[PDB]
Design a protein around this ligand. Structure first.
Ligand SMILES: [Cl-]
Ligand SMILES: [Cl-]
Lengths: 31, 31, 31, 31
């Protein structure tokens, strides 16, 4: 189903957002 | 598919939670 | 499909793991 | 389903990444 495929996409998009958050936090922490 | 939908909802729920927890951490570190 | 349902489950399980990591990090940071 | 499978793989890939990034942060904070 394309509804499921589309949900996969949305999920992935949230994971990229999380990775951007982490990139910021790693710099705040001087990593 | 109704079950997959429930798993899709639970997953997005958790993702938003994680995003918000990381946003609170970034906010606190920036202070 | 049950293959997709089972993948949903695995994904969720990783999100719980992430939440546990975060719980630890929030305490390290005195939140 | 082959496409959903590729999205499932990309998602798990990202999750492992995030888990490892958070593990490195917890390790560094505990030092
Ligand atoms: Cl995509
Ligand atoms: Cl489950």
């Amino acid at each position: 189903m394309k509804q499921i495929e589309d949900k996969g996409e949305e999920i992935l998009s949230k994971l990229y957002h999380i990775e951007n958050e982490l990139a910021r936090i790693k710099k705040l922490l001087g990593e």
